[PDB]
Amino acid sequence: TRDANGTWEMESNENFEGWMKALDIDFALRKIAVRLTQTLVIDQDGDNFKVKCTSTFWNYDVDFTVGVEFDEYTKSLDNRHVKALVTWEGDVLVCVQKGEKENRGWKKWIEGDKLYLELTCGDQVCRQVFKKK
Ligand SMILES: *C/C=C(C)/C=C/C=C(C)/C=C/C1=C(C)CCCC1(C)C
Numbered sequence: 001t002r003d004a005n006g007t008w009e010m011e012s013n014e015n016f017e018g019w020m021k022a023l024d025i026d027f028a029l030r031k032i033a034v035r036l037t038q039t040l041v042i043d044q045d046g047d048n049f050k051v052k053c054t055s056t057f058w059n060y061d062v063d064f065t066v067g068v069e070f071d072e073y074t075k076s077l078d079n080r081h082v083k084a085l086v087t088w089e090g091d092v093l094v095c096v097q098k099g100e101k102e103n104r105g106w107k108k109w110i111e112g113d114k115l116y117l118e119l120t121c122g123d124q125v126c127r128q129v130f131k132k133k
Contacts, residue, residue: 001091004110008040008130019119019126023078033058040130072097
């Protein structure tokens with residue numbers, strides 16, 4: 001339940017546009033992002049994670065150590081500085097990103113070869129489901 005290693009292919013993505021709009025992503029870009037197939041690759045070594053979410057010309061990468069606050073600059077997204085922190089709440093991997101936006105972060109629930117990812121910003125939640133390839 002705590003092993004997120006692998007290559008994960010998207011099965012579903014709900015409220016992606018509402019969450020992107022809460023982050024202030026350009027409206028024109030949102031209409032492109034909605035079309036792009038996403039692949040999520042996670043390398044997890046103890047507390048050390050490398051997360052890479054990739055598409056045709058738009059990627060999001062983040063590396064972190066569980067329990068260690070880090071400065072995150074969302075250079076490929078909304079271009080903001082947040083103080084990010086990833087922790088385990090039971091078997092849920094929880095990220096809080098402290099900064100301008102309220103309720104900003106993400107959570108992963110790993111259920112075998114399924115990964116549920118919820119991205120939050122403001123009053124918006126984006127719900128994604130991936131299957132391990
Ligand atoms: C644990 C997994 C996480 C935190 C994955 C996060 C992925 C993203 C924030 C992806 C964002 C993207 C866009 C908003 C537009 C299109 C390109 C993406 C998929 C990289």
